[PDB]
Design a protein around this ligand. Sequence first.
Ligand SMILES: [Zn+2]
Ligand SMILES: [Zn+2]
Lengths: 705, 706
Amino acid sequence: HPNLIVTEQDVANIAASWESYDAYAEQLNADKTNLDAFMAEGVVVPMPKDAGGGYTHEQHKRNYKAIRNAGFLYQVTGDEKYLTFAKDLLLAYAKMYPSLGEHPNRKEQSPGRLFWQSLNEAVWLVYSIQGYDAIIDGLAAEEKQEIESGVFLPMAKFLSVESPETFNKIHNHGTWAVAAVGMTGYVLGNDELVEISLMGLDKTGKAGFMKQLDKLFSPDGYYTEGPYAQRYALMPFIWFAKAIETNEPERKIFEYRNNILLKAVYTTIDLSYAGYFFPINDALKDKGIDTVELVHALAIVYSITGDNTLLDIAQEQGRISLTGDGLKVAKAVGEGLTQPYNYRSILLGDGADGDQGALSIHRLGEGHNHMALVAKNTSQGMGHGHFDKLNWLLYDNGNEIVTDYGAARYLNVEAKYGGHYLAENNTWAKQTIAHNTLVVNEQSHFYGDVTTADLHHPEVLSFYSGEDYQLSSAKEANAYDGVEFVRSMLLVNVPSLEHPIVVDVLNVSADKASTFDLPLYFNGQIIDFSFKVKDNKNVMKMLGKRNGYQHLWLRNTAPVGDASERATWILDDRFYSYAFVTSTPSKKQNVLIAELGANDPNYNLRQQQVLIRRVEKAKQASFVSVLEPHGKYDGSLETTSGAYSNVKSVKHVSENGKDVVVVDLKDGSNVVVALSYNANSEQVHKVNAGEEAIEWKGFSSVVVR
Amino acid sequence: HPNLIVTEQDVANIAASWESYDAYAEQLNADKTNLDAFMAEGVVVPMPKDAGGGYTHEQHKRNYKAIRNAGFLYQVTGDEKYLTFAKDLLLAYAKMYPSLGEHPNRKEQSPGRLFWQSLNEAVWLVYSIQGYDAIIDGLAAEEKQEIESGVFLPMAKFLSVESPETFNKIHNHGTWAVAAVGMTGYVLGNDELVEISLMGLDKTGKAGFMKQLDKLFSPDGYYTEGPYAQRYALMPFIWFAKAIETNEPERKIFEYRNNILLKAVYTTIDLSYAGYFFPINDALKDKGIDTVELVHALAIVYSITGDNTLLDIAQEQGRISLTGDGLKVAKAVGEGLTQPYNYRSILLGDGADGDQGALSIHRLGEGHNHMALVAKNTSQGMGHGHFDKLNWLLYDNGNEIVTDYGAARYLNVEAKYGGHYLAENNTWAKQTIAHNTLVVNEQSHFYGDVTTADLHHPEVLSFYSGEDYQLSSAKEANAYDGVEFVRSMLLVNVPSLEHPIVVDVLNVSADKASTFDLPLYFNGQIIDFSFKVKDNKNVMKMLGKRNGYQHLWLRNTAPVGDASERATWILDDRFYSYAFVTSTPSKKQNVLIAELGANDPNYNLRQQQVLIRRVEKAKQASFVSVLEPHGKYDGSLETTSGAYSNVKSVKHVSENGKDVVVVDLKDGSNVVVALSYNANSEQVHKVNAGEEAIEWKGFSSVVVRR
Ligand SMILES: [Zn+2]
Ligand SMILES: [Zn+2]
């Protein structure tokens, strides 16, 4: 002991060299200093009272971190004050725990004792057991016995046999539970606890850790609920794996399922941009790569693989794992071994077999602050999922440009409903109108019904990644009765332009005349519009009555027609121009500029603007657009250039269900995008685009003339 | 040569050691790389066509930087291609310039030729003449005469004798003009041009540089228009001074007016927080200490003084002056000589004599991310001034907390009205309602009349800075007919609390019963309010008809009364709680939550929220409040602590014009603030609060009672 997340040899290596690595030493010293301050407050173990974000909740969180850090610092420095503090905390817990019933403000579905919900109880155990592992050296037999019978065994029992619906769950809450109990199993030398964690309560392998490894990741290491859920699941997966590896290496856990755990870690990184995870489905916008689950996971994977490109990400994290694996990262960074991360455009198939729709991630450009397009053509993702089939996000210049709201929630802020999902999470954040995808008749996809949405996934039609252009194309046939829509999204490299451009083609057919809405949630300040806004007459009225529309104010409506229109905005030092045209038999076309905040008496919603393209009384529409990063603005040096869009216009023609988009540029050149929706790469196609005839092979073609 | 902003000795020093200093070398190499790329485009000198932010405007800007940079790099590297490019640009300018009339899209008030306004023309000359100075010794006599007779002399003549209304102006546009002409005079060895720059066109000293030094700064080096104008004026002041020093050291320009230029540089720094200038009056929110004027000025002042605390600020700038003076900064930093900047609480008297009201800057805490309260008790500042007497700003934790909008303008963005002031600059940004100060009957101070406002300044009643607390108190008796108001703002050190708290007391008396509004423009996301908002019925109406009110949407109203109320919000990793109570005979009082964006069809205005305290109908009110930073939110590590306010309530009592504020804390302790408005430090005062009697001496007292 220790022999779990750190080994005795790890401790010896850390003791020998931690002061030699500047960032590791700064990290370790910060922790030491902070713990010293916490210790001066004494041993403070309150009776459970408060739910999420409340005092007792955050106090017991502070204690599990203290137990773990104290144990580590005892091993590394030899200072008995850290042993004594960790010991005294655990003895206080051992005295208190046996008397605890259900938390007084418990969560209905999975209650805890120490905590309002059993989830945090599992986290407590994961951390606290490591601290215990690290202090066993300095404890008397009777102290071990008291702590083990007082808190560890009763808590392990609670989280396992007394909570079968969580422990046998094939879900990240199950992952946390089996990691907590299994790690306890390894530290305490309790084979039963280890076995039930690996193979479920009945030990058959129908549930448990091995089943979770098979079910909770696609073969490429993608977690269906999204990056936010993925990074959270990554800790109990990678820490229980680390524990299995240090105790039972013969199980070859890091080889399991074609190295699924390694793949899960790389995929977590590939679900981020400029340090932040793509905020799709339930997600908080401030969650990024310095989150501790990925800090630890990266160190573990670096230790296994020696992949020096991981060191690039490590530097971007600005936080290092205080472990033996972290020491290896610090050493390699200090030796100048860092290589750049190889960002790839990837198609991540959804579900355990990677066959339930997919998340497309298209990247173009050098370094971390490149251009990234995300096409969300994924399955539902259960109750965590948003009603946003074929949604998209755009990143550029280190910023989110075309955005996803994430969840309506304030993490661990008790005054915001105990840090839990707010009423507006369902009524705003999940709804289709809140996203950059098609809304029909002011109703959400699947009519906002999770049960229906869970039965369906989008059909991916094409994925292409080349030096000329990038493409994803997908079909949604099940979101509404008598409606089908297809969306193709492209990143096009135009040599004459500073930055790649997005081309978007969203086609819709409906049995009955409908309203079609396509929002664009943008980040930045409007410079100008090509269209004329109607006077709002000094009032903003709620946009609509239901399904998220009741949360939007209408700031202006602007009538539009056959010709393409433009909106240009600034964000930091770059301009963005959205050129858009909609082909439809209907003449009832209008642009709505809306702002978030109606039906929000509790001020839970952020300020946010949106450009909504609306067609009314239509059975068919082709929403076409271009998104163009351009120019420079430097407020510091007081300069600018290329502030005007280089797109003169956008035109669209559809013939025999095949699409042609012509982007006319200001220098007299043009870009032609052609879509056949036919996978046969050798099949020739022909479309009459007004004057000229367009001829191409394959699913798609892009030509710059 | 060179002998202006850099000297021959400077070049020697740089040549001997520039690659020894990492940051200096990195920036020099960056400039070199950028210039090489620019040079690959060839010599591109378009005929003048576009105004602010337009192509020709920004191209000629790129060119003046290129000429200066090329000159410098020629001197440092000895590479002739840099000489050749600087020469070729200037010869192209020499060919074009004599043919130029007024710019085709010229500014009415002060037209340029190369640029739409003469201001940018002066900047061009200031930069380009340094480039010329650096290459002149490598040019043939005929090339020198072509450049001098073709561009520099006619431009100097244009900016001076042909523009007497600008050249003789006691204003920073006059400073830019005299710097441009005077620097030209030194480089060309033309005594006439130097003399008229120093002493005005008629050489009497009624106008010119020396007069500007006397009139444009207070004795403490404060520029009346505000930090945004100060930093801009700082370049021609400090660079012309530098040129004067390298050519005529006997003038002792850096000693003039008790070291006014040195004080002006320090004051510029003292007008910043966490790298950004206080956005008072006409200001753009992205203007900060890395602005080149302060970069060069700081290096110059460091070279003169050897003040190692300036090195702390230089590091925060993240940009170094590529000069000999900048080399000394880089050297001193590399030698580990940096000391922390000594931030001071200061009273900056306004006007040339520092006697027209004042800008109070109160600072508390260590490092750069401390707490800073700004009390704007200043004169109008003429056309650039806002109608916001007794306005305040609060900074904390590296952020602006209680805010000032600045100007409605997008710098060099041609599509936003040629980068000029937008319609909403006058109708929104200048108006009193857009600020954190008293608004009477929905009209701005001085009824929004700049002529009236220019005649008056607030009366500073008290300024105190101690370990226990900080205070500014000021009176405004002229903003409205038959209205007088007094505001006292405090920063209070409460040992039991994590951060200092603001205490605010704003008293108003009016001859006629009036509506009183006190806005608070805050930065961050609302957590909760103690009050109960009325249902807005799914509509936001424009808040009022005139004077800035026409740009706000009413989101919610909520009734308030005798008991104090609270708003708590979050910004990054900290919470802020505003506890507030208003003493008044008024039957009704309301809190209005409003949002910016009404009457903004062109989307010129930013998203912004505001909490407005309204007294419906009264002759008197005392607006009392506490602003409290507290707690921690960490979204990365997923923890919180101290997220609830520690202020239980705030209570106010007035007796015989003397104020007592009691702040009750959740741990059962309290803070008592007493204000007598009597400057006699020995005078005893008594006010009956609850049943307790509050007794103290002096203008103010603050006691923390455990
Ligand atoms: Zn979403
Ligand atoms: Zn202002």
